[PDB]
């Protein structure tokens, strides 16, 4: 069920001989996830800077261990990566990564005895946190998190904070993560079969300090401290369920962001960046995300989406931002494969950003899936920047047109052997997959002259679970 240690993994693979493969088998006490990835990326800066190009290959080995004793259980997953350059082998992301490294990915203890519900448990340690949209949390982080998942009622509550990367190559935390504590919760109900309504809350509190006036500031220093609360409502009808039987699936969510930020101000003095003070101000921002998916027949689906995170406003009060724990990856095209909601290439954060999206998808049982996604992006306020994105180039003042993107994701799932056999029958539950995942980004007028006319980021992933 939902407490299984691989429940949230996007791959959805089942090892041969596991209890999930055959309910007569005992739960596995250990296993190995193997990933081989190639990445082609050109060019993250749109040709405005040296570097920013990848054409490289890597292997990622993820052994794991699991123990269960009554209501207690424990889990560890490690990671070893070797690659020809610093590629992305992990969609979930002294800050220079090495080509090769070791990591402690997950380590937690879990207690399920507070209630008799198997859907209820308490988990403590570095753990996968995820909700279905991927827009609030989808990350491995140190946390204490309570989950309650039953037919009529779902609820969660937890607290989380990064203390290390637990990596051999990254010495320090990203500044936004340093001394930031997250508290969060959600409650939702299935008010009709396959229709869910819920509320969600998240609070992020920065206990750090900003550099004082006259101090040099570098990439490891914070740009702001905040106390931010997100309050959201969400309605879904099989939004992220690739096995829906309904002719139509939908999601609608609205989120208010309130609180305050202390923003560091700086000036450049002799190749240096020097702190000049700080400015505080309230945040009163809003985000929405809507989508509708047509289940045309057993194999074909298509749909449309719209999202907007506010931007600008009086002294930047209307600049929406996400929690910083999000992936923005979800099953919104209606397939077993998760897709970046705002482009594999652009990788937009919902922040001073408006996006319109169209997709079509195709799937065949548990054996194949494919999605084609089109996005158009605009700035909401053409003098404010946007949030994070997979594009590292300056925006020109006064231009709303961010660009357009076309994404393709194609996946083959299989079981027996290293690679599929053409004589193999349709797989009941696959243990391995091969995937192409690619995005083509066409910059719009906001990127100005001297930039490339197109950018791409594409991956081939081979994944095996043993
Ligand atoms: C707060 C962080 C918690 C970190 C806990 C990490 C635990 C790592 C791996 C889980 C395996 C626990 C040991 C299993 C064991 O010794 O015996 C059980 C197993 O061999 C048969 O049931
Ligand atoms: C096993 C049951 C655990 C019960 C503990 C419940 C923990 C308490 C609240 C969880 C919901 C998140 C609350 C968010 C919050 O407190 O911040 C809101 C505040 O910042 C508004 O200004
Ligand atoms: C209808 C297809 C829309 C989605 C297209 C996404 C695929 C993006 C690129 C194609 C993958 C090939 C990657 C290799 C490549 O393009 O050449 C390397 C590059 O540096 C110069 O082209
Ligand atoms: C039931 C007890 C079993 C204990 C399992 C230990 C697993 C073995 C090694 C995991 C290493 C844990 C990560 C430690 C670590 O990386 O610390 C990082 C430092 O703080 C510097 O970043
Ligand atoms: C094929 C083996 C796969 C198993 C890999 C498990 C690796 C377990 C723990 C490695 C993480 C330990 C990090 C230790 C460390 O020194 O990190 C801190 C560095 O000094 C960065 O400043
Ligand atoms: C970039 C990918 C292409 C995006 C396509 C987006 C299209 C949005 C919605 C498609 C609606 C599908 C309607 C299907 C339909 O009407 O079939 C009717 C049949 O005749 C029923 O018998
Ligand atoms: C580019 C590197 C390899 C990437 C592999 C990604 C997935 C590969 C192939 C998917 C092919 C999709 C067409 C499937 C199809 O037409 O039907 C399959 C048959 O019905 C069953 O054999
Ligand atoms: C679809 C994108 C994945 C294909 C890219 C494969 C790259 C193989 C070349 C590895 C050599 C890299 N290099 C030149 C730095 O050594
Ligand atoms: C399988 C391909 C993995 C490539 C690892 C390459 C590591 N190294 C040092 C040669 O770059
Ligand atoms: C069996 C070879 C072990 C290689 C371990 C992975 C890379 C070495 C650690 C480098 C630090 C980053
Ligand atoms: C505050 C967030 C709670 C952290 C809970 C997990 C801590 C255990 C991992 C640290 C070693
Ligand atoms: C506003 C209400 C947000 C729901 C949080 C409650 C979590 C339940 C424990
Ligand atoms: C509006 C969201 C309501 C969530 C359901 C919580 C109470 C269940 C009856
Ligand atoms: C979006 C649709 C949500 C409907 C609200 C729940 C009604 C309860 C009967
Ligand atoms: C569950 C309710 C979903 C709310 C989404 C409604 C769209 C927001 C329109 C706000 C206009 C400003
Ligand atoms: Ca470049
Ligand atoms: Ca329980």
From Swiss-Prot:
Record's GO cellular component, any one?
A: cell outer membrane
Q: Where in the cell is it found?
A: Cell outer membrane
Q: Which domain of life is it from?
A: Bacteria
Stored InterPro entries: Alginate_export_dom, Alginate_Permeability_Chnl
Q: Which GO terms describe its biological process?
A: alginic acid biosynthetic process
Topological relation to the membrane, as annotated: Peripheral membrane protein
The UniProt keyword set, sorted, is: Alginate biosynthesis, Cell outer membrane, Membrane, Signal
Q: Pfam families from the entry?
A: Alginate_exp (PF13372)
Listed Polar residues bias regions:
319-331
Q: What pathway does the UniProt record associate with this protein?
A: Glycan biosynthesis; alginate biosynthesis
Region described as Disordered = 307-331
Give the family from UniProt: Belongs to the AlgE family.
Q: Briefly, what is this protein's role? A: Has non-porin-like, channel-forming properties and probably functions as an alginate permeability pore.
Q: What is this protein called?
A: Alginate production protein AlgE
- The record lists the organism as Pseudomonas aeruginosa (strain ATCC 15692 / DSM 22644 / CIP 104116 / JCM 14847 / LMG 12228 / 1C / PRS 101 / PAO1)
Q: What is the lineage of its organism?
A: Bacteria, Pseudomonadati, Pseudomonadota, Gammaproteobacteria, Pseudomonadales
């Amino acid at each position: 069920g939902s407490s299984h240690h691989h429940h949230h993994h996007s791959s959805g693979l089942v090892p041969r001989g596991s209890h999930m493969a055959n309910s007569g088998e005992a739960p596995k006490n250990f296993g190995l996830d193997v990933k081989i990835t190639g990445e082609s990326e050109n060019d993250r800066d749109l040709g405005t800077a040296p570097g920013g190009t990848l054409n490289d290959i890597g292997i990622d080995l993820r052994p794991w261990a699991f123990g269960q004793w009554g209501d207690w259980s424990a889990y560890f997953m490690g990671q070893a990566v070797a690659a020809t350059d610093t590629i992305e082998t992990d969609t979930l992301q002294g800050r220079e990564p090495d080509k090769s490294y070791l990591a402690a990915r997950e380590f937690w203890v879990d207690y399920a005895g507070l209630t008799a519900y198997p859907g209820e448990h308490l988990r403590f340690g570095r753990q996968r946190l995820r909700e279905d949209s991927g827009q609030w949390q989808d990350t491995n982080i140190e946390a204490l998190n309570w989950s309650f998942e039953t037919t009529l009622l779902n609820a969660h509550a937890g607290v989380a904070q990064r203390f290390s990367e637990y990596r051999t190559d990254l010495d320090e935390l990203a500044p936004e993560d340093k001394d930031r504590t997250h508290v969060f919760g959600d409650i939702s109900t299935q008010w009709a079969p396959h229709h869910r309504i819920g509320v969600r809350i998240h609070h992020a509190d920065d206990s750090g300090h900003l550099r004082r006036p006259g101090e040099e500031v570098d990439n490891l220093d914070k740009t702001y401290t905040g106390q931010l609360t997100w309050l959201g409502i969400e309605a879904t009808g099989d939004a992220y369920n690739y096995r829906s039987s309904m002719p139509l699936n939908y999601w609608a969510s609205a989120t208010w962001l309130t609180g305050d930020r202390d923003n560091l101000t700086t000036t450049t003095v002799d190749d240096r960046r020097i702190a000049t003070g700080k400015q505080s101000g309230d945040v009163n921002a809003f985000g929405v995300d809507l989508g509708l998916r047509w289940n045309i027949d057993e194999q074909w689906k298509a749909g449309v989406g719209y999202a907007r995170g506010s931007g600008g406003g009086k002294d930047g009060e209307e600049q929406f931002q996400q929690t910083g724990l999000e992936s923005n990856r979800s099953n919104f095209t209606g397939t077993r494969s998760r897709v970046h909601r705002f482009g594999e290439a652009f990788r937009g954060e919902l922040s001073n950003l408006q996006a319109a999206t169209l997709f079509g998808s195709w799937q065949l049982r548990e054996d194949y899936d494919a999605s084609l996604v089109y996005h158009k992006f605009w700035r909401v306020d053409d003098d404010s920047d946007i949030g994070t994105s997979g594009i590292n180039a300056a925006l020109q003042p006064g231009e709303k047109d961010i660009g357009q993107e076309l994404d393709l994701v194609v996946t083959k799932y299989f079981k027996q052997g290293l690679l599929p056999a053409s004589m193999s029958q349709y797989v009941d539950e696959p243990s391995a997959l091969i995937r192409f995942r690619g995005g083509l980004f066409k910059p719009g007028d906001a990127y100005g002259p001297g930039t490339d006319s197109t950018m791409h980021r594409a991956f081939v992933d081979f994944i095996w679970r043993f």
